[PDB]
């Protein structure tokens, strides 16, 4: 025989004949695996980024403004960890860029913002693929192949230089075009490729690859680099689409989408997932839902943070219900971690006023004691926790531990009972009159 039920403070008691009581106070294993969450400083600075307004259907707090960015978390993670990569890439694709210099008109601004974002994304991809390719260059025995690999690191200049040095001069000149999107050069390169691929007794295997890069459609094609699928990180090839590929004509999103349309990514890979959500634009949510049922690469916290950023930055659109779903899930994980202040903060991003009310109330009353320690706990109860709820909860804690000003703000008769001096009586009378 065994017994076990869930605690008020959601944790589990079970038969245990090894203790003293005949039960075990088990700290429920928290799925929430992300260090900086247990440190209260993060939470304080995170509340500093929010504007809380009371609801239009009750007095309970819910978020009106958020300035949270994928960017912000990066200080609390190791620049070496894969997590940091996820959050960084997510910042690059989703956090708004600012362009400090004034611009003649605003469509211009938009264009600059696109170039900036593109440049950062592609510098980052080059950061990732870096060692892979450098290894490959280490082992090559052929110069033209090396030139190609340098193009794989988006280094036009060293390709041009090696070309020059290995006496491949014309190619060298041609190379200098990579990253200007000159459609003339594009159609010319493609033309040269068709002429070769119709007779062309023999063309060097890597020169054709380079021409294919100049064509602007390196997989999308008829001399296709798609087979390199088996020799390179998917990210490496995506770099090729993003750098050459047809930058100007496409939006970053539809370009990335173009690439993804040519190659399935591994279901489990999360940096993959982020690119897919980025490219999915018109139906991010749709994809997000799809991503949910397929993999766990995106954790509860991340999914909530993502949804919230995109929501509060106009970046993207999510159902009230999906945003609330995410929010519930994360708030719950947090409460399982005895992180009540933090779960409380998260609970406010609920859209459904009824649910927010219940969740918040329930938790505050159940856990008032812990939520009234430091100033980092004060700002907490100065989220906009309703005066009523706070004192009410506090009234309950007094009846159970065996107050009066709170009551002044049946039960009253019992309080009078407990009181059974003249000045106190007079004050009570005045309060009653009021």
């Amino acid at each position: 025989y065994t017994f076990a039920k869930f605690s008020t403070g959601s944790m589990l008691l079970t038969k245990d004949i090894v203790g003293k009581s005949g039960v075990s106070i088990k700290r429920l294993p928290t799925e929430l695996q992300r260090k900086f969450l247990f440190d209260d400083v993060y939470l304080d600075k995170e509340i500093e980024k929010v504007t809380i307004e009371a609801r239009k259907s009750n007095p309970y707090p819910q978020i009106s403004e958020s300035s949270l960015l994928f960017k912000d978390a990066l200080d609390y993670m190791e620049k070496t960890s894969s997590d940091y990569n996820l959050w960084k890439l997510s910042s690059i694709l989703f956090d708004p860029v600012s362009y400090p210099y004034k611009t003649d008109n605003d469509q211009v601004k938009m264009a600059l913002l696109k170039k900036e974002r593109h440049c950062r994304l592609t510098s980052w991809i080059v950061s990732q693929i870096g060692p892979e390719i450098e290894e490959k260059i280490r082992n090559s025995s052929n110069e033209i192949e090396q030139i190609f690999l340098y193009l794989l690191l988006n280094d036009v200049v060293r390709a041009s230089k090696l070309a020059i040095e290995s006496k491949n001069g014309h190619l060298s000149v041609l190379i200098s075009y990579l990253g200007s999107n000159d459609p003339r050069i594009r159609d010319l390169a493609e033309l040269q490729l068709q002429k070769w691929s119709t007779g062309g007794c023999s063309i060097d295997k890597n020169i054709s690859k380079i021409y294919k890069l100049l064509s602007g459609s390196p997989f999308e094609g008829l001399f296709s680099l798609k087979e390199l699928e088996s020799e390179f990180s998917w990210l490496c090839l995506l770099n090729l689409t993003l750098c050459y590929g047809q930058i100007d004509e496409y939006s970053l999103e539809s370009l990335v989408q173009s690439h993804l349309d040519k190659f399935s990514l591994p279901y489990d890979d999360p940096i993959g997932v982020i690119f897919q959500l980025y490219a999915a634009n018109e139906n991010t949510e749709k994809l997000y839902k799809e991503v949910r049922q397929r993999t766990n690469a995106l954790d509860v916290q991340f999914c909530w943070y993502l949804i919230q950023t995109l929501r509060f930055n106009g970046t993207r659109v999510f159902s009230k219900e999906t945003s609330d779903e995410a929010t519930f899930a994360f708030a719950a994980q947090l409460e399982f971690a005895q992180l009540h202040g933090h779960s409380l903060f998260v609970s406010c991003f609920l859209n459904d006023d009824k649910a927010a009310e219940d969740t918040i109330k329930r938790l505050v009353m159940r856990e008032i004691t812990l939520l009234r320690a430091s100033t980092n706990d004060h700002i907490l109860n100065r989220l906009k926790i309703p005066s009523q709820l706070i004192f009410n909860a506090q009234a309950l804690k007094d009846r159970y531990e065996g107050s009066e000003v709170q009551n002044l703000l049946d039960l009253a008769e019992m309080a009078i009972v407990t009181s059974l001096v003249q000045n106190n009586e007079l004050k009570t009378l005045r309060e009653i009159l009021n």
């Binding site: 076990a4 869930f6 038969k15 004949i17 009581s21 106070i25 049922q293 708030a331 649910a355 309950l396």
Partner: protein, 274 residues
């Protein structure tokens, strides 16, 4: 010496634990992480105390326990000294479950005994009991859990393998049965209503036939939906089944010496977690 405690309960704020064993005594502890200091022992039953259960602190410190002696005993701490203030034994057999209502209902209690009965004991103005009982199950009732709500209801698990959902009615003044559900081949050991005020309602019904059916009702209308948690019998008979407040996690106490945990995923089906 405490080789077999049958039930333990935690208070609203979790400072005071109350275990109850077979030697009839109910021990109260002041918990503090590793160190639960024994503060009390309570002897007033004529058989193994099956279950204990604190009430909402809105009603001071009250604890209704039910034991094999067919009697429900209400206790209360008084200036640091415990005292059996009331008792309710209108049941002709071993009383199994005892669970308080949501504190919005008053101080209601839910007793469920082997004489196929389940009572709802109000405590009036004189603090005296106001029993309004109903017949619940044929061959006996193993458990009965309350439902929260904002039209009150509860569930009962039977010895005829039924799982019943009762509702209050001002016309009847006694809880009128509104829906029964069939899915087990042996004594329905425990039944649990989930405290999730979310889109739907969830019921985890553990049983002797080593199954755990989950009755998910869409809403106030469309009837329940049968879902055998997993479709293989557990290595041994299952006993207890509890929901989590924050999250809708399910804890299952099988007679196989671990407690499993099951969470709902976006398939709607349930997956282990731990």
């Amino acid at each position: 010496h405490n080789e077999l405690i049958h039930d333990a309960v935690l208070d609203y704020y979790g400072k005071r634990l109350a275990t109850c064993s077979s030697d009839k005594t109910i021990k109260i502890f002041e918990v503090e992480g590793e160190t639960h200091k024994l503060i009390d022992t309570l002897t007033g039953h004529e058989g193994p105390v099956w279950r204990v259960d604190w009430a909402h602190p809105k009603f001071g410190t009250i604890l209704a326990s039910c034991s094999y002696d067919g009697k429900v005993l209400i206790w209360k701490e008084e200036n640091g000294r415990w005292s059996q203030i009331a008792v309710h034994a209108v049941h002709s057999a071993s009383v199994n479950s005892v669970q308080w209502a949501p504190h919005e209902y008053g101080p209601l209690l839910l007793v469920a005994s082997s004489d196929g009965k389940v009572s709802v004991v109000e405590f009036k103005e004189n603090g005296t009991t106001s029993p309004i009982i109903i017949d619940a199950h044929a061959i006996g009732v193993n458990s009965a859990s309350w439902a929260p709500a904002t039209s009150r209801k509860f569930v009962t698990g039977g010895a005829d393998n039924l799982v019943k959902i009762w509702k209050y009615n001002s016309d009847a003044q006694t809880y009128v049965l509104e829906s029964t559900l069939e899915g087990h081949s042996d004594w329905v050991r425990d039944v649990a209503w989930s405290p999730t005020v979310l889109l739907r309602s969830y019921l985890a019904s553990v049983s002797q036939d080593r199954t755990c059916i989950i009755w998910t009702q869409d809403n106030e209308q469309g009837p329940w939906k049968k879902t055998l948690l997993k479709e293989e019998k557990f290595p041994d008979v299952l006993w207890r089944a509890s929901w989590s407040l924050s999250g809708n996690v399910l804890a299952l106490s099988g007679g196989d010496n671990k407690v499993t945990l099951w969470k709902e995923n976006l398939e709607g089906k349930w997956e282990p977690a731990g």
